[PDB]
Design a protein around this ligand. Structure first.
Ligand SMILES: O=C(O)CNC(=O)C(=O)O
Ligand SMILES: O=C(O)CNC(=O)C(=O)O
Ligand SMILES: [Zn+2]
Ligand SMILES: [Zn+2]
Lengths: 332, 22, 332, 22
């Protein structure tokens, strides 16, 4: 049930703002950072929404005006799409799949340019959609630098130390239009996902649901993304999607969602909820040291096999036929 | 075999380097 | 067409002595050792029957009486079976497949014991079948040692040198009853197969027919053997067996069949042809050094993947499910 | 990956060793 905003400002959002899907879900726990149960969850690589870390406390005031004024003159990657779905793709892998035609294009622009584009669409009632996704770097301005420095490093550093994680590799700034969706995928890093403006519905699936989510081949540009179209699932090609079960939540300003490494996640900015802003914190996982093997370890194994085969055969397109040749009449 | 890389939905100063520099 | 034996002794064998199968074949070339075409074939890892190497010239006089008298008091492995089919199995791998029940059993005995058993079966009109298969070693007697030393080492050593092969690992003595069959399999060594007494029909398939022959899993005791029952093929489990095409020949005393590493072979002692005797020469292949990859190289790759997965998962029985999980909805 | 073992339908003096000894 949607939470009530302090001061009797009503419900933060309602059901009608959620897209509808074919699968059930259970709620991710929302807990205080001081609650031992939250620590148990993170330690165990299970998701949890933390309500009071103050992780990005100083960014809570951010909005397009403040960012345009302070974020510098660096370039920003902005994706453009004609659908609500922003399927991630790896440009470096495009050569090996000449027939893949991305539904979204990346354009580099200045922040003011991004803001202007958002304005032109609104005014012209256009259907175009934009999603800015850009790692925070040295070119940001003074005020932003001050804000960044005011993040709760004390808490997040203890988290990094307590779990044996590797280094912070980056913080991605995500600014999206209402209704935008990042389709289901898994990342190979641990993520603290800090919501700043607006509301995002996050649906997660554990690594042991690999069989139900059907990731693209490792050498395909959509490596790590699910092939299933959540809006129109093809149960013929992906029969086990009929067995998928999610853990869901809606995060708002101030909330931090722990998205554990290898966990699938589908993220959507609420319909009619305005622009969203998020900043993530990506950490390399702990080192690989016992049976029985964990689901995520098996996933690590499958990726490696695919990778080795691709190199050994000299053509990634030869990966499938060999695998098929290996199992038919033998293991299936 | 059990070893893993660090790929995510973003291309490869930032992170730890950004923070320390700041 | 069956050859004519010197001195007008008639046909060496006839069609009625061949078992019947569902697939077609083409003849393997029979050539003189001095013929350049024979050298081209071996160089290219293609089968050839050499008619005049004199490779085991001194063994042409061997028969059960001479061997019983001269082969020593060492132990001999003898397989016993109630079917004509002597499917090879690796005893060391039996623990990992508790449910595999071999159709043949191995018994160690003295040569005279083997000969006696052959006699008791004949006399008692029994249906039992025996196949002796034993590596030649130090315990053989003086006369046999003399015979072995008289093999044409000059020719076979040049062959080993010309092809870059590794060392002679062994020579297997095979003594079989008429009608015995060794079902289709591939060996990881190069083989010069020297026929001594009786006639054997040898049907070979190139390594690129892997998809049609359906070898057992690498960790299963029948690793390297085809799962298809040539006498009653199940086209439902093994549909591509309907596309298999063999290279066949019948070898007799004095002939040497080159069976190239990784080539499938099915070997049968002619029906009503009496006992057969053969001695093989197994050499390690040359070293692994260019695209496009050869069929046998791909086979090498598949074995390795299976092997690595088995070790990595800690249970070979987990190999299939992981592979299946890797391809369904992804590569198939 | 392309590397191979030397397994055949027989268990593991003989071969080269038998010959030289003789
Ligand atoms: O917020 C989004 O739309 C996408 N974010 C992620 O997938 C992530 O942070 O790992
Ligand atoms: O002769 C036989 O029955 C079996 N021989 C082989 O499979 C071989 O020599 O490689
Ligand atoms: Zn992600
Ligand atoms: Zn063989």
């Amino acid at each position: 049930e949607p939470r009530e905003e302090a001061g009797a400002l009503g419900p933060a959002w309602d059901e009608s703002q959620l897209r509808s899907y074919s699968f059930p879900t259970r709620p991710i726990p929302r807990l205080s950072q001081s609650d031992p149960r939250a620590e148990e969850l993170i330690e165990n690589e299970e998701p949890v929404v933390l309500t009071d870390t103050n992780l990005v406390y100083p960014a809570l005031k951010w909005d397009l005006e403040y960012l345009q004024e302070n974020i510098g003159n660096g370039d920003f990657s902005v994706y453009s799409a004609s659908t609500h779905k922003f399927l991630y793709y790896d440009e470096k892998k495009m050569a090996n799949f000449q027939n893949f035609k991305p539904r979204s294009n990346r354009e580099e622009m200045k922040f003011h340019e991004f803001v202007e584009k958002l304005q032109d669409i609104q005014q012209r009632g256009g259907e175009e959609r934009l999603y800015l996704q850009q790692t925070l770097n040295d070119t940001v301005g003074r005020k932003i630098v001050m804000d960044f420095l005011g993040f709760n490093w004390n808490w997040i550093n203890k988290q990094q130390g307590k779990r044996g994680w590797g280094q912070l590799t980056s913080n991605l700034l995500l600014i999206g239009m209402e209704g935008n969706v990042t389709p289901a995928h898994y990342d190979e890093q641990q993520n603290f996902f800090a919501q700043i403006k607006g509301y995002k519905r996050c649906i997660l699936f554990p690594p042991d649901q690999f069989e139900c989510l059907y990731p693209y081949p490792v050498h395909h540009p959509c490596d790590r993304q699910s092939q299933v179209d959540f809006d129109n699932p093809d149960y013929e090609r992906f029969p086990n999607f009929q067995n998928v079960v999610g853990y869901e939540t809606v995060v708002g300003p101030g909330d931090v969602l722990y998205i554990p490494m290898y966990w699938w996640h589908h993220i959507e900015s609420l319909l009619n909820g305005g622009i969203t802003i998020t900043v993530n914190f990506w950490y390399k996982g702990a080192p690989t040291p016992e049976y029985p093997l964990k689901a995520h370890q098996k996933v690590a194994i499958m990726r490696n096999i695919e990778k080795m085969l691709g190199e050994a055969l000299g053509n990634p397109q030869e990966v499938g036929p060999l695998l098929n040749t290996m199992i038919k009449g033998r293991y299936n | 075999l059990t070893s893993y890389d660090c790929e995510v939905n973003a291309p490869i100063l930032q992170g730890e380097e950004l923070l320390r520099a700041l």
